[PDB]
């Protein structure tokens, strides 16, 4: 393999979701289930719109993205 380049990655920074080892709690949510290491977080667009985008945990942790707050985890760190 290696020629099949159709993969799901961060639509914000382009990097792939290479870290999804974190068990969350109190979610029990399902937006067509969860993606492999990818959390679609509902963010706000500067054009005045709300969009679900696939964001990598790296970007989620760095929090340097245009966000509408889509993280309700009860643990700080």
Curated annotation (Swiss-Prot):
Gene3D superfamilies: Ribosomal protein L28/L24. It holds the Pfam family Ribosomal_L28. One of its GO terms (cellular component) is ribosome. Residues 6-31 are annotated as: Disordered. Keywords: Ribonucleoprotein, Ribosomal protein. One of its GO terms (biological process) is translation. GO terms for molecular function: structural constituent of ribosome. The keyword Ribonucleoprotein applies. Belongs to the bacterial ribosomal protein bL28 family. HAMAP family: Ribosomal_bL28. This is Large ribosomal subunit protein bL28. It comes from Thermotoga maritima (strain ATCC 43589 / DSM 3109 / JCM 10099 / NBRC 100826 / MSB8).
């Amino acid at each position: 393999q290696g020629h099949m380049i159709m993969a799901k990655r961060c639509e914000v920074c382009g990097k792939a979701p290479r870290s999804g080892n974190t068990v969350s709690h109190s979610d029990k949510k399902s937006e067509r289930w969860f993606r492999p290491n990818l959390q679609k977080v509902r963010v706000v667009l500067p054009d005045g719109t709300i969009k679900r985008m696939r964001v990598c945990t790296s970007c989620l942790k760095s929090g340097k993205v245009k966000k509408y707050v889509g993280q309700v985890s009860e643990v700080g760190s």
